[PDB]
Subunit: 293 residues, 2 copies
């Protein structure tokens, strides 16, 4: 029950086959200039310096790959907003990986605010800041919480309800809408409908590829802990139900306006492609994904 | 399929039996003083006056009943925040009942901001206003939207996902936390985990008692449209599935801290008690629930 290794090839193949059928349009990776990428990493290092833990360039590149693969390049209008999501994504990844003893809100929240005020106008900066604040506060609050155990062990419905916030997709939407300046997208981001539509597609994929690391760290936030991964028949049943969940969400995403659904589907499919390419999501513990103590 | 009247008595009885078994604590109606009720209704009339339609006192009292029944009186700490929620709930009910040709945002949004600035501190006022703005904007955007058709006709999971915003519970949470000044509750309100935990319990009850009215007005946002209510066997299997959903949520709510769960459960159970004594939720069309044209 400690590993999904036996299912790795087939589940990867099945994810891709599902995306080829239901999304069709391939995600595309954003290429940052060398100037852009050192500005991102500089800002990242400055923001986490108060917490006292060094983060290597290779670790930052592993965190940032998600942003590069899962945004929607055809619709990008504000690259300053794009760099903000790069920085905010990465530094909150450090926080997700940290022992809660290192979580210093008094030192870290000002740095998040500093990032938001650099890259966003005043209105957008407050929305992005509030969502960053809510994300790191939730991750901290729920470490060893009985609420988390209840929502993660009861049913898929309770679990994905927790993940709307905990995986950070609500935060992502609320800091990403300035990239696109698309009124419908902005409204769906601020109601969190955008986040709720994309939660299962992001979470099922992440869970599959982060399972071995998480169970080794005693982390319970993973939907495949709801099935006996040691029982191939039970596992494949559960995996098919999760594919069905993704498919229904994707088919409903296609009722949204064209630009909004492009972005939603680039997010889910791009996250999958970035995940299969990311050292973070291979070995259960390596030098880019080990717990920061 | 026009009516759930045949199931009225047994469904009411089953809801109450469920709450007696799973919640136990009875909800409590808040008494307002005469001066308090008058301040609330005056504020309501001033806020909707720019839209041109008179709203009777009896209609306001039908709207305000949900707030009086569904808050958590033992935990109340700020009766100014309480009156704000009365007013905000009531005037956005008028919006919910309006033909969208009456939806003047330029006239109505400044009235919502004025309400929030009268009753809340500066931070709280922004949060309450953002959520009121998001609520009235959503109701308007989704009148005859293909998104709403997709989410309301596909499955219960897509439907309740829409209702987290559309029924107004996220808005309710984000304008009610100042009533309690309870740090945990305030964080769950701001992540929307509060709203997600309580969405099905509010919606299933509201949908049952507003079905006849909504079907008569061509309104599709009602989960019992997903089953053939003219088929007694199918209706009862669908209704049991919805009771199971409510029970699962309630049992998970009990994992939250004591005050938060009191508030969450008072909301779900109080909304039911208020619904069963509210003239709005009887006749398909009467003089407190008719469409405002
Ligand atoms: Cl965890
Ligand atoms: Cl409707
Ligand atoms: Mg996490
Ligand atoms: Mg993690
Ligand atoms: Mg993970
Ligand atoms: Mg409505
Ligand atoms: Mg309505
Ligand atoms: Mg209704």
């Amino acid at each position: 029950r400690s590993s999904v290794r036996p299912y790795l090839e087939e589940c990867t193949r099945r994810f891709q086959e599902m995306f080829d059928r239901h999304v069709v349009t391939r995600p595309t990776k954003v290429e940052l200039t060398d100037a852009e990428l050192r500005e991102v990493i500089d800002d990242c290092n400055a923001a986490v310096a108060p917490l006292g833990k060094t983060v290597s360039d290779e670790r930052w590149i592993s965190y940032v790959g998600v942003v590069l693969w899962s945004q929607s390049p055809r619709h990008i209008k504000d690259m300053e907003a794009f760099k903000a999501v790069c920085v905010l994504n990465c530094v909150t990844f450090v926080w997700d990986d940290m022992d809660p003893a290192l979580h210093d809100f008094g030192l870290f929240l000002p740095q998040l605010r500093k990032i938001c005020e650099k890259y966003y106008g005043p209105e957008d900066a407050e929305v992005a800041y509030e969502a960053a604040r809510a994300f790191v506060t939730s991750d901290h609050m729920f470490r060893d919480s009985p609420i988390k155990a209840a929502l993660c062990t009861t049913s898929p419905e309770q679990y994905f309800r927790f993940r709307v916030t905990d995986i950070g997709v609500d935060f992502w939407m609320k800091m990403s809408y300035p990239i696109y300046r698309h009124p419908e997208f902005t409204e769906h981001a601020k109601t969190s409908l955008a986040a709720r539509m994309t939660t299962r597609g992001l979470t099922i994929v992440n869970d599959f590829y982060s399972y071995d690391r998480e169970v080794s760290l005693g982390q319970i936030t993973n939907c495949f802990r709801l099935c006996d991964v040691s029982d191939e028949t039970a596992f494949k049943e559960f995996f098919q139900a999760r594919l069905d969940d993704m498919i229904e969400d994707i088919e409903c995403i296609k009722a949204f306006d064209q630009l909004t659904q492009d972005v939603f589907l680039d997010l889910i499919y791009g996250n999958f492609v970035g995940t299969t390419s990311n050292k973070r999501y291979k070995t259960a513990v390596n030098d880019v994904n080990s717990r920061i103590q």
